[PDB]
Amino acid sequence: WAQALLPIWTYTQLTVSAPLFAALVAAYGIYAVTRYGIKKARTRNDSHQCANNRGWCRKSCFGHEYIDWYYTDVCGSFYCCRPRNL
């Protein structure tokens, strides 16, 4: 891969671009792509990553994830959501 041409259900969830997004929708399926937290260049929300690799600081985890910590308190207010499929 070199560049995470698949930065979500197998890693965490990253914002990249349309070329990357399309590659994932084309290979996997749009639903999982926009499910776990990929982004077609925009970032999900004000939410930002923690450890910039382990999990993403979010306000609440969806029905396919779990709150991870260590970082939830370094972020302070946000919940380091790390999807369970990952």
Give every strand in the sheet of 79-83, ordered side by side: 48-50, 55-58, 79-83, 65-68
Solving technique: NMR
Distance of CA 63 to the CA centre of its chain: 14
List, in order, residues 6 or more apart from 32 with CB less than 8 Å away: 8, 9
Residue 25 is classified by DSSP as: H
Question: Residue 20 gets which letter from DSSP?
Answer: H
For residue 36 the two structure tokens come to 């776990």
Give the residue extent of every domain in the chain. Answer: 18-83
CATH number of 18-83: 2.20.20.10
Residue 16 and residue 34: Cα distance in Å, rounded?
Answer: 13
Query: Alpha-carbon distance 26 to 70, whole Å?
Result: 35
